[PDB]
């Protein structure tokens, strides 16, 4: 075989993912990332229809928790949760909502960083 | 319809 072990590359890639998550949680992005630090509080916000339209809520805090608990089998799985988070926002809010603009700015950060993970994501 | 209000 030789070369690098697949389990090692996956771990390296998940480490890059952790670093991307850390980047997204930095104070630098606070102006447009804060709405995604925690789960959306439908109750406290009066969004009585949030869990109706959004079947799988997601947020940076939860993704951070799953990463810390070694729950992602690979980078694609991590990416899916990040995109789910943005998808939820685009689906629940009106296209012109201020939070949508913030999501897209934060997604600009994510996509540009994720894509620069050395080589291409392994399964 | 409800709408989220960011602060």
From TrEMBL, chain B:
Cellular compartments annotated: Chromosome; Nucleus
Transmembrane region(s): none
Source organism, top-level taxon: Eukaryota
Subunit structure: The nucleosome is a histone octamer containing two molecules each of H2A, H2B, H3 and H4 assembled in one H3-H4 heterotetramer and two H2A-H2B heterodimers. The octamer wraps approximately 147 bp of DNA.
Family: Belongs to the histone H3 family.
The protein's name in its UniProt record: Histone H3
Species for this entry: Mus musculus (Mouse)
Gene: Hist2h3b
